[PDB]
């Protein structure tokens with residue numbers, strides 16, 4: 488029963504073997520979900536499921552620097568469903584972020600902003616109810 492948008496502190500930034508876990512329910516008639524791994528006002532990793540982009544479901548990933556978006560990465564595999572519970576797991580590794588949804592691998596996003604110690608906040612927003620958010624070293 489967390490309030491969305493929710494800011495999860497990542498003190499000391501991210502590092503290899505850090506695992507972030509987000510639990511919630513997609514609202515009925517959802518349009519999008521956003522997880523923003525922020526470096527101050529910049530976004531090192533934007534993970535953005537879209538439920539109705541031109542009548543299709545897609546995952547868009549990108550990086551924002553100085554208010555401008557970089558080149559998009561796109562994935563047709565879409566494990567979310569309107570009205571249903573979900574579990575997002577983000578594993579940080581030396582070269583990328585690895586994302587799994589409902590315990591199944593979804594995608595990898597290579598680090599563009601390499602100073603991992605400065606990625607100190609995760610913003611969770613969009614058309615969801617949020618149950619829990621945590622991070623641990625595994």
Ligand SMILES: OC[C@H]1O[C@@H](S[C@@H]2O[C@H](CO)[C@H](O)[C@H](n3cc(-c4cccc(F)c4)nn3)[C@H]2O)[C@H](O)[C@@H](n2cc(-c3cccc(F)c3)nn2)[C@H]1O
Pocket residue numbers: 519521533535540541547548549556559612613
């Ligand atoms: O890159 C990632 C960004 O994407 C843009 S949408 C982007 O806009 C571009 C404008 O030039 C293009 O239109 C681009 N595009 C679409 C197509 C295309 C081509 C063919 C068919 C078809 F279908 C589609 N080609 N190119 C769009 O993806 C979102 O607004 C933005 N964002 C989202 C949020 C945000 C939202 C909610 C909460 C929150 F916290 C943040 N805050 N910023 C972020 O997610």
Ligand SMILES: [Cl-]
Pocket residue numbers: 519537540
């Ligand atoms: Cl969109």
